[PDB]
Amino acid sequence: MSHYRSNVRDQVFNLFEVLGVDKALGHGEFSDVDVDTARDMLAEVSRLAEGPVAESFVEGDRNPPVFDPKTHSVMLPESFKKSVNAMLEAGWDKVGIDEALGGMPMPKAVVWALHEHILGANPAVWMYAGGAGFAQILYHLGTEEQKKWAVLAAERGWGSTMVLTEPDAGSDVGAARTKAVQQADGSWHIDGVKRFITSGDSGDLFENIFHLVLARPEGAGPGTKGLSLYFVPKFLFDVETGEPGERNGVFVTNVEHKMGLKVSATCELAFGQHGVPAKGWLVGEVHNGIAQMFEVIEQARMMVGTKAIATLSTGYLNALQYAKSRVQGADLTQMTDKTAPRVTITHHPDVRRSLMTQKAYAEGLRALYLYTATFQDAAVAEVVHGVDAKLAVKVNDLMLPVVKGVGSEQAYAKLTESLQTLGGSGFLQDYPIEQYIRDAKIDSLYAGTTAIQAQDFFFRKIVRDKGVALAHVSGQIQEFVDSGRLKTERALLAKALTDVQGMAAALTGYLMAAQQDVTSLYKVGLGSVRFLMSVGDLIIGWLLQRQAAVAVAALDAGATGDERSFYEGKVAVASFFAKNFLPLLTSTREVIETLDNDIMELDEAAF
Amino acid sequence: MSHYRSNVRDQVFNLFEVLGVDKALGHGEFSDVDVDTARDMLAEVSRLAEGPVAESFVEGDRNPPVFDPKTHSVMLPESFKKSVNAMLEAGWDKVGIDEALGGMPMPKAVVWALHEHILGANPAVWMYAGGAGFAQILYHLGTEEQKKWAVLAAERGWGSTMVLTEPDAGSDVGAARTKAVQQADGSWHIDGVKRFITSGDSGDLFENIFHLVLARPEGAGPGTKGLSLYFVPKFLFDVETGEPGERNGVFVTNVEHKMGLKVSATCELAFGQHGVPAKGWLVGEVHNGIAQMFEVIEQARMMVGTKAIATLSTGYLNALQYAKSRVQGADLTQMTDKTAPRVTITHHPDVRRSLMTQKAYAEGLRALYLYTATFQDAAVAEVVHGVDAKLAVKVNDLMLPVVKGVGSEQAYAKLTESLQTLGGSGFLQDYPIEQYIRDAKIDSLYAGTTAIQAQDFFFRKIVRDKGVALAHVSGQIQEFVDSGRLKTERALLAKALTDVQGMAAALTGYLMAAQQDVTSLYKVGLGSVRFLMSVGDLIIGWLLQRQAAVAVAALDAGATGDERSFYEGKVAVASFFAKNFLPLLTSTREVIETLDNDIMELDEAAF
Ligand SMILES: CCCCCCCCCCCCCCCCCC(=O)SCCNC(=O)CCNC(=O)[C@H](O)C(C)(C)COP(=O)(O)OP(=O)(O)OC[C@H]1O[C@@H](n2cnc3c(N)ncnc32)[C@H](O)[C@@H]1OP(=O)(O)O
Ligand SMILES: CCCCCCCCCCCCCCCCCC(=O)SCCNC(=O)CCNC(=O)[C@H](O)C(C)(C)COP(=O)(O)OP(=O)(O)OC[C@H]1O[C@@H](n2cnc3c(N)ncnc32)[C@H](O)[C@@H]1OP(=O)(O)O
Ligand SMILES: Cc1cc2nc3c(=O)[nH]c(=O)nc-3n(C[C@H](O)[C@H](O)[C@H](O)COP(=O)(O)OP(=O)(O)OC[C@H]3O[C@@H](n4cnc5c(N)ncnc54)[C@H](O)[C@@H]3O)c2cc1C
Ligand SMILES: Cc1cc2nc3c(=O)[nH]c(=O)nc-3n(C[C@H](O)[C@H](O)[C@H](O)COP(=O)(O)OP(=O)(O)OC[C@H]3O[C@@H](n4cnc5c(N)ncnc54)[C@H](O)[C@@H]3O)c2cc1C
């Protein structure tokens, strides 16, 4: 087969044995979707991922897109084009999207499980083909006239981009200087240069591209609150039929050469700099740019974390496959006997430690993004968690920085173990883990760096939230921990919950203290990322133990064969994680409780 | 200037203010080298590394060597060949080499500090140019006839290789099947295929290459003990003048395609398979192969750890230079004020945490390999540490797994922080950190995987050694923590010593219990790598506090200006490491004390 190894069985286990998404199927907007329908779609898309989508994964990296400056055009490998069009011709880009746009209803938890397979097999495909998902947001936020455009965009299959960054405005989006001047007809003319734009051009892959652009109206206020969101197409088009017309003044002027994700054209995109106006329209005809754009960012941050996790999972499964078959060395128990038979390396304790660590974070993080996705539909959140719509929004907001920040960083860190499992062969392009690592590095940077995720998590999702969402998740873990074979694991989780609550209390103390000495805030920043990562380990631990309980019940009821091996692996991985990673949170709490500002007051030249 | 950023000042600090190498200079073999001569040499190689050597760093990766299968030859980029020849013409490969081979005396601590700059600027240069260091080993081990061959190899500038690995014999060197058949004329015919041979061919870069080859003499016993070391030249040569002659029967048949270190040709090397016998000569005319080859392996393991550390250093320095000039966002104390002045990112807490983390491991690991190198000369070890020659060998042996294993893994892990400091630009090939990471990942694999290092460290360097070397080093740390501003840090180091000593006790306990239940050994394997990493952190913490003590003295003695900034940085980094990384060892100890065999008993199919 291909490089991509899927795990539909684990997705089904989470969705329909552990998390309860099955109880929302057959109800609400999912009247005509049952568990069998969702299972079949998952198997169907996993086969597409493993075949036509994965087929161009290697070539996308080895023969990157070619950029021609004078026609401002990017040419993608033909094999990649077919991969994208194989996905689109099957309609996987439209599941969960409004029926007006050609979609059919589906819980986001299932949608993200479906898209996991695409993100694992060839993530850039998902990016180039996000047009309809972009159209969904434009449909939600636009005037009635702009809704017809969104409908057209979805059906003519346009490509799409999210356009915020400028050389001087990356983390600080509010510093952007791309400007917008209103025209007599109500149109606007966009004028500026944007940097690092994913899918900024894609050649003849699509009939059109509609950029969603942040720009500052002439005379607008400063910062992010002064930015407005604009619909700017590559081609002007017939507002009735969608037929592309005159080329609009939006041009790629450069394409970055990157560590990985090479098939995703990361572009310098110029608006109105080449003699042709960049005509655009104010989304919703209101000035509400940063709020509007964050509907896109929220999806971007979910995708990026799910991508990081999809990559770890297939990285782990490739390493496991290799390890079962690689003979090297003798069993440690027969070390003195140098004539002892050679064994497969899964017999070596460090290889099993490595593989169980990979397993725990692949499956642990899979559970985490699926659990997060059960809060992204109010109806699913209601039936699974018994929370009302407002609280579900708060919990999803709480969990997004965890999915993105912990997923990106832990996936990359544990792909190191995947590669280590192959020995020297892991350093070769013959195996895909090398590329997995290069493609995954980006996940801690774009859609907001980890430091921005951790700042958002504490200041916006806990402090501004008054801790409500965190107290809800904490309370669910408390109940789980207070409720035979899993008693030791639950006590380690009780300790980890207490450790994380002590982290949050210390950081809130630093926050409170800042009223007397404002530099106390630096301590919060110093601890923010370790706190973010600790919460992730806590929720991974809990979800894995919820899985282990379902597995114990399945084994007692007489599981046999492959199902028994699946459930046996869940008991072991939940216990392994509890004993090897949860106790580390104790030392981290002590460090966070002890933070000082020595390194803040240090002279910069001392570094 | 170039990508490579050096730190001569820190090397001097370690060598001549902390570690006491100055006491050995001016005496014994080092008559002709004083502190000043060494500082100038470090500065001189500093500049060669930054210029002619770093010149080809980028091209070597983006235009890798071309393999010609019909002539079994590798063609290296011309600019890279210039870099190698610039190193050789300045004689940096012969520093510390026997005078018979064109070298002059130099303590190993200074030699590795010299080579740090080549390894950071273009590590493959060091590898290709290592021929003279190979000859020194040939000179030590050879018959009188072979020592003349070693002289000619050093004088004619030949390249060299170390040839062990086969497809079925990587970590398990003893499974190699390359054969050796003695001829009437006293030579042997080598027959087999070797894999992954660094520098297996180099085109016209050198006049000859002498391969050091492990092979199994006809009728020898199994495992590493049945292997012998053979001298196998690319060209047969006149044994009096060294003039190359007939082509010997050893040919490269493939070159690997790798993640990084691309300009190092990693070759499939075939002996006696292309119709021409591969003539070789038994090194020392004795069958001591694995012990002889381990003289080479010990240098390779020191180099790999030093390379990884050299790479983290220039990664940190590049990120630091970038952080000081990158304007993004405002001070955290003004987060509510959206009009606040923009600041350089060095003002942000998470960036300073990141930078101080990179600093502590770059400088901590530099101290580690320099400390280790003070045991690689008997005269130096006596003057500096007061230990006899045989104990110095044992300590060096103890530390080689630390330098290679901990250096390789921690350098790669912390380069993630370096790249993160660049934000989105770190993912660009426009900056060198992307290449650092790819070039560094191999450090955890070749010259023995991290698991091999951890196994060697415990079973051979602690258990076979009867705790002598470990007891000596721990004794020095015990002394140190029992000796105002460094008091808090001293106590954290004491706790770390107790923690590591508890890890050792637990592992020794598991070893003893293997007398009754031999599976207990598996627990040793499970904790082996974490134990090794913990010792690294202990020794890093210790050395940084030794540096801090020296720095405090210099501060109170009236240091000013840039020297004051240097010394202040050492105080801060030693304290930061003590407070943020040493306490984490307590939880690691608890994990090691609670290891069990559940994941060993688990069915393979359950993974
Ligand atoms: C049915 C089907 C469904 C289909 C749809 C799904 C599919 C769609 C397809 C997805 C496409 C993905 C394509 C891939 C492209 C790659 C992504 C990128 O790199 S792209 C680029 C990625 N770039 C980045 O990620 C930017 C990174 N930088 C940051 O995030 C900064 O922290 C900053 C810019 C927010 C700071 O600015 P500063 O002015 O200090 O900010 P303040 O703190 O003052 O907040 C101001 C206002 O912002 C707002 N708002 C804020 N936070 C949140 C939130 N978390 N959350 C929400 N809103 C949030 C809020 O309105 C707030 O006002 P208020 O409510 O308070 O009144
Ligand atoms: C100015 C100078 C400028 C230029 C400088 C040039 C310097 C020189 C060249 C530098 C290198 C060039 C760069 C090349 C980079 C490629 C490096 C590689 O990958 S290639 C290398 C890649 N491949 C590897 O690294 C192999 C990795 N695999 C291993 O290490 C395995 O553990 C194994 C082979 C030892 C197992 O086999 P098994 O038979 O079960 O192991 P046992 O436990 O039973 O010991 C058997 C005998 O071996 C001995 N001996 C053992 N250990 C050590 C030691 N630490 N320590 C010492 N000796 C050791 C010992 O004699 C022992 O006998 P005994 O004393 O006990 O009676
Ligand atoms: C491959 C790729 C594709 C991209 N595609 C897109 C796209 O389609 N659309 C788009 O809009 N953007 C895109 N970007 C940009 C992306 O959104 C990133 O947010 C951007 O690269 C980050 O800003 P920067 O690179 O200027 O880094 P900076 O913001 O300059 O960050 C540099 C360092 O400073 C730290 N830092 C910065 N500000 C703070 C702060 N206030 N507190 C603490 N630490 C801070 C960061 O964490 C980081 O370590 C892409 C980037 C890449 C690499
Ligand atoms: C770039 C590069 C250059 C190289 N250059 C040279 C060279 O010049 N000369 C040379 O002789 N070799 C060279 N090698 C070979 C290199 O030393 C081997 O790849 C290395 O020893 C690992 O062997 P392997 O690839 O077969 O992995 P394996 O031995 O198959 O290891 C696979 C996995 O099993 C684990 N494992 C194996 N045995 C054990 C055990 N007993 N206990 C616990 N875990 C175990 C490993 O840690 C790893 O995770 C090079 C390799 C590379 C990648």
From TrEMBL, chains A, B:
Stretches assigned to the Acetyl-CoA dehydrogenase-like C-terminal domain: 475-603
InterPro entries per record: Acyl-CoA_dh-like_C_dom (IPR025878), Acyl-CoA_Oxase/DH_mid-dom (IPR006091), AcylCo_DH-like_C (IPR036250), AcylCo_DH/oxidase_C (IPR009075), AcylCoA_DH/oxidase_NM_dom_sf (IPR009100), Diverse_Acyl-CoA_DH (IPR052166), FadE5-like (IPR034188)
Pfam families with a match to the protein in the record: Acyl-CoA_dh_1, Acyl-CoA_dh_C, Acyl-CoA_dh_M
Keywords of the record: FAD, Fatty acid metabolism, Flavoprotein, Lipid metabolism, Oxidoreductase
Entry keyword Lipid metabolism: yes
GO biological process: fatty acid metabolic process
EC number assigned by the record: 1.3.8.1, 1.3.8.7, 1.3.8.8
Domain Acyl-CoA dehydrogenase/oxidase C-terminal residues, every copy: 288-454
Pathway: Lipid metabolism; fatty acid metabolism
Catalytic activity: a long-chain 2,3-saturated fatty acyl-CoA + oxidized [electron-transfer flavoprotein] + H(+) = a long-chain (2E)-enoyl-CoA + reduced [electron-transfer flavoprotein]; dodecanoyl-CoA + oxidized [electron-transfer flavoprotein] + H(+) = (2E)-dodecenoyl-CoA + reduced [electron-transfer flavoprotein]; a medium-chain 2,3-saturated fatty acyl-CoA + oxidized [electron-transfer flavoprotein] + H(+) = a medium-chain (2E)-enoyl-CoA + reduced [electron-transfer flavoprotein]; decanoyl-CoA + oxidized [electron-transfer flavoprotein] + H(+) = (2E)-decenoyl-CoA + reduced [electron-transfer flavoprotein]
Listed GO MF terms: long-chain fatty acyl-CoA dehydrogenase activity; medium-chain fatty acyl-CoA dehydrogenase activity; short-chain fatty acyl-CoA dehydrogenase activity
Top enzyme category: oxidoreductase
UniProt domain Acyl-CoA oxidase/dehydrogenase middle: residue ranges: 162-271
GO CC field: plasma membrane
Cofactor: FAD
Subunit structure, interactors included: Homodimer.
Family to which the UniProt record says this protein belongs: Belongs to the acyl-CoA dehydrogenase family.
Protein task: Acyl-CoA dehydrogenase that exhibits broad specificity for linear acyl-CoA substrates, with a preference for long-chain substrates.
Record protein name field: Broad-specificity linear acyl-CoA dehydrogenase FadE5
Organism of this sequence: Mycobacterium tuberculosis
